[PDB]
């Protein structure tokens, strides 16, 4: 994976030149935002289980997904979906700390749609769950940090689609 | 099931089913009708079982989300009780805990911890349901039914 600093370094390196002033300004913006990024990571790490519980409550409960014949039927499938949401939240936190979505593409989104199609996991339902998770995180950590985290949640949702 | 377990054991060793395994399978196929009768008895009486057991469970475990004034929580708890009674009946049909384990024992703790429902309350409810069920079964039929209740209780205990 590459983070924001490494992304700028790679952008400058393919041209064989040092970081131009605009790249330095982007780097300084990332350095200035690191404090709120760490604060958001702390909050999400402290409330991960609550976040996933609220996400499932407002996105998947009492629908046909949890009924027999749904994809969250039986406790094993329910726990598997909860584990997938835990993965999504943790790697969204990783990407928010890193300042870019490379980790999401490398560890999650590469072939996740194919795996879900093979297993019969509904893509629309999990996109809805990711958007509900974005709303839950925004409610927990505030507006600005919520938007920063929603950038990567939207990246996950787009990658699934 | 035991049929599936025997087939898997034979398959692992790249051998046909041995005479002892075939004798075991024949014995369970002979007992299938009795198990079907027991499961039919469980299914036909599931509503009274759930009613009595839920009343007992709310008596003994009042501080539980279903007993909190929320209609949705109470309805979901009653639905879950009926669900588990029916699952125990189906696993009695099969003759081994494998279907009940595959549907509602593997990952039950994780599912109900994500739902924020105490698993000790579930153990109390399953105990009450087991008592009510044993009230309406013979000792011979209870010998077939009770171990599945115990398997569920063990799988629910933290």
């Amino acid at each position: 994976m590459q983070d924001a600093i490494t992304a700028l370094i790679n952008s400058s390196d393919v041209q064989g030149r040092y970081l131009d002033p605009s790249s330095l300004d982007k780097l300084q913006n990332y350095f200035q935002s690191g404090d709120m990024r760490a604060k958001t990571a702390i909050a999400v790490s402290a409330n991960a289980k609550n976040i996933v519980t609220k996400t499932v409550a407002k996105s998947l409960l009492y629908t046909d997904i949890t009924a027999p014949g749904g994809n969250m039927y039986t406790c094993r499938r329910y726990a598997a979906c909860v584990r997938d949401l835990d993965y999504f939240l943790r790697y969204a936190t990783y990407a928010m700390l890193a300042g870019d979505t490379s980790i999401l593409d490398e560890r999650i989104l590469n072939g996740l749609r194919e795996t879900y199609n093979s297993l019969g996991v509904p893509i629309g339902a999990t996109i809805r769950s990711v958007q509900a998770m974005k709303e839950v995180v925004t409610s927990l950590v505030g507006a600005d940090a919520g938007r920063e985290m929603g950038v990567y949640f939207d990246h996950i949702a787009a990658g699934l689609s | 099931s035991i049929i599936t377990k025997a087939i898997a054991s034979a398959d692992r060793e790249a051998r046909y089913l041995s005479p002892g395994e075939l004798r075991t399978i024949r014995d369970f196929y002979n007992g299938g009708e009795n198990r079907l009768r027991i499961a039919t008895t469980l299914i036909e009486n599931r509503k009274e079982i759930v009613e009595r057991g839920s009343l007992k469970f709310w008596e003994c475990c009042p501080d539980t989300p279903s007993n909190s004034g929320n209609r949705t929580y109470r309805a979901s708890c009653l639905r879950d009780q009926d669900w588990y009674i029916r699952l125990i009946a189906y696993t009695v049909i099969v003759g081994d805990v494998e279907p009940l384990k595959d549907i509602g024992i593997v990952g039950v703790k994780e599912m109900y911890e994500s739902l924020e429902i105490p698993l000790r309350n579930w153990v109390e409810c399953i105990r009450c349901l087991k008592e009510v069920t044993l009230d309406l079964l013979s000792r011979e039929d209870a010998a077939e039914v009770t171990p599945y209740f115990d398997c569920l209780i063990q799988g629910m205990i933290p």
Binding site: K58, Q131, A132, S161 | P62, S68, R71
Partner: peptide, 26 residues
């Protein structure tokens, strides 16, 4: 169809008097 926020609407008067209390409390 990348937006599903319209379907995540989530899922009153109490149905029990004096909830979460034991019988015959001293």
């Amino acid at each position: 169809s990348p937006r599903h926020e319209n379907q995540l609407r989530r899922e009153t008067v109490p149905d029990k008097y004096n909830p979460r209390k034991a019988n015959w409390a001293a």
